[PDB]
Structures are given as structure tokens and as C-alpha cells.
From a paper:
We demonstrated that the TCR from the 1E6 T cell clone bound to HLA-A*0201–ALWGPDPAAA using a limited footprint and very weak binding affinity. Here, we solved the structure of the 1E6 TCR with 7 altered peptide ligands (APLs) determined by our previously published combinatorial peptide library (CPL) screening, 2 of which mapped within human pathogens. Concomitant with our global analysis of 1E6 TCR binding to the APLs, we observed a common interaction element, consistent with our previous findings, that utilized TCR residues Tyr97α and Trp97β, forming an aromatic cap over a central GPD motif that was present in all of the APLs. Ligand engagement is dominated by peptide interactions, but hotspot-like interactions with the central GPD motif enable the 1E6 TCR to tolerate peptide residues that vary outside of this region, explaining how T cells expressing this TCR may cross-react with a large number of different peptides.
We also solved the structure of each unligated APL to investigate whether structural changes occurred before or after binding — which, combined with an in-depth cellular and biophysical analysis of the 1E6 interaction with each APL, demonstrated the molecular mechanism mediating the high level of cross-reactivity exhibited by this preproinsulin-reactive human CD8+ T cell clone. Competitive functional testing revealed that the preproinsulin-derived sequence ALWGPDPAAA was one of the least potent targets for 1E6, with only the MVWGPDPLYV and YLGGPDFPTI demonstrating a similar low-activity profile in MIP-1β secretion and target killing assays. First, the 1E6 T cell could still functionally respond to peptide when the TCR binding affinity was extremely weak, e.g., the 1E6 TCR binding affinity for the A2-MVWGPDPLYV peptide was KD = ~600 μM. The weak binding affinity between 1E6 and A2-MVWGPDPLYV and A2-YLGGPDFPTI generated thermodynamic data that were not robust enough to gain insight into the enthalpic (ΔH°) and entropic (TΔS°) changes that contributed to the different binding affinities/potencies for each APL.
Author numbering:
A (entry chain C): 1 to 10
B (entry chain B): 0 to 99
C (entry chain A): 0 to 276
Write the structure that this text describes.
Amino acid sequence: MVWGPDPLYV
Amino acid sequence: MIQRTPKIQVYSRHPAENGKSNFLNCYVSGFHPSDIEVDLLKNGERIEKVEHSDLSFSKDWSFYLLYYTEFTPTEKDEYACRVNHVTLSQPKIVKWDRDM
Amino acid sequence: MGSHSMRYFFTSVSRPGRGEPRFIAVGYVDDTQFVRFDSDAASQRMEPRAPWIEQEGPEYWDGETRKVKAHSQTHRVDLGTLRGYYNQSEAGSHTVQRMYGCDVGSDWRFLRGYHQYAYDGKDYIALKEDLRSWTAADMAAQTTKHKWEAAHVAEQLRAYLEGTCVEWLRRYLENGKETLQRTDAPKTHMTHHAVSDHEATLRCWALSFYPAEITLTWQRDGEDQTQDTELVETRPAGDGTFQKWAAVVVPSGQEQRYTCHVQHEGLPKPLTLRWEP
């Protein structure tokens, strides 16, 4: 299962 | 940035026996950036039905891909892989040697 | 089979001439690919690549699709932000790469987690082994580090890498047991190749093995030899197994002095091959 919900931008 | 030229191996899935169906593989690895063109060739002509793996990368961030197709080796037919990449001035051809 | 891992790989490549970045995501359990997403594919869904994941239901695939699309949008934003942190033209294509995942030991309990990010093929920012702090490679990434510390990104990843990632790895290992818990020991043989009347090459082959980790070593009279040897990079067969060979050049007639030693998870004791023919 992938990480969620939404990876923070750089 | 860094441009890294591809390493190339050309080989069969199974030990090659003349007249027996097999798979021909061209494994390109160690390259960056990811855009690359790879064809498999039979007596110098591009083979049409070639498939490839989904792009992934190694610990050093360099990319790798497997290109492959069904083939039937013979004593006379010559096979090879032709690769172009921003790091190459002209396409590179590596011939299949069935002992490698 | 021993320790295991689950890892996700993401690549985004900008397309300055027209359109959105190309985005490709792949997931692995050990050395087995099990899911893909490709922005250039027609489904616009996370897709199965192994038989044991096809039984997940529609809530699974919808969730995975939602999350991997969100990753793709983050990377799009990041391509833009990074062109700016680096003062680069709008004309060139650039690359973001991210990899994260978890390892479990033979007891299937958490061993380690990781999260690494790269821009143009070089390290940008990575999670340290404690899962609490970050390594930033340059001053752009140091600004990202401060932002991610304020947003508590490492707390959220840590909970995923110790929690969810391990839990679903274990579910996959169970569901995929016929293959994922099977080790395929290398099928080994040696060949011989006369170069001249006085020297010959011996090639030790390891075929059809899984996982990909393997060691091939030559010895002469019981001591390791690296001179006059050659080792190819381990390569995929295309059926899920791997291949490798190692070779040595020897004085013809002296082949019997030389031994190939093969170490692999699938071999309770290492194998020793000798040209006795």
C-alpha cells in the first residue's frame, strides 16, 4: 500500500 | 546535470538451442536521464513486437529497463540490441553471443 | 524467505514543450514487481503486475489510484519549485525521483524504513534511520527540511513506515506465499572455452534464481582469485528470476585447480563447482 493521503511538496 | 551512459547486456532467457523458441533480452542499466531508445534487431533489421519493463531505478538513482521479445535462434541468424541515449553520439549496437 | 521488503519507486520527468510531466510508479515486494502506474497508459489506474495482488477489491484499487495520482501532482509542483530554487531555464526537461519503503526481519517485524528524494539524479533530501530527522544535500534541500520539520512530515511517514507499510507487506507475503516465500536456488553449471592451445576460459553460470542477491567467487587451490577474472552484473531473465556468470582465464590443463563458489539464500550451504571433465 502506498503512502497517503498526499505527500508534501518541497 | 550528470549524464550516465547505459550499460547493455544482450542474452536469452533460456539456454539457446537452434530451432527452439526462446526470449531475447536487452537489459539496459545505469543510465540517466531516463529517455532512451532500444530496438532489438534480427540480421540488422528492427524487430516489431518488442516489449519492455516498467521504468525503475537503483540505489544510485540510475535507471534500468528490460526489453524483450520471443525469438527462435538458428545457426545463421544474427541478433543484436541497438541503444541510443543523449550520452551516445550514434546508436550503440551490441551483438548477441549465446555463451554470454 | 528470511528478511523482506516493500518498496515504491516514483519517477517524474518534465515535458517543457507540451503538457504535464511523465510519471511512472512501481511497487515491489522483495524483487517482485506487483503494481504499476504510468501516466501515458490508458487506464489512469494503479494496475496489478502479480497474481496475488489481483484479489484486492475495488476499494483498494481506488485508494491506490487516488494516492498515486496525488504523488504525481506533488512531483509536478516540485519540478516547478525546483526549477526556481536552482534558477534553471523553462526549456529543459528535469527529473524528480522518490523511493520509500520498509524492511522486516525473518520474524516479519519492522527492521528499518526509508524515504529518499532526488532531483536530476542526485540526492536532494532523505529521511534518517531514526525516522525523525532529515539529511539535506544542499541549501535548497535545507529550506525543504525546515518546511518539512514545521509540517511534521517525518512523524506522518514514520507512522506509515512502521505501521501501514509493515502491515500490508505481511498481508502480501501471506497472500503471495506460493511465490514470495519460495526461494529459487541458482541452477549452476560451468563451461569451457579454449582461447589458444595454452589458455582457456572457465565460465561459472548461475541461472533461474530468486531473489537477485548472489555471490560468485573463484578460488585457485583454495584461495580467492580476482586477477584474470570477469563478473557480469546480475540481470533479469524476464520470468521473474535472475542470471549471473563469472569467468576466469587459466592455463589449459590446470582447470582442476580452480573452483567456483556460489552463495545464495536458497542454498543451505554454498555450492562449489570444478571442471572435472
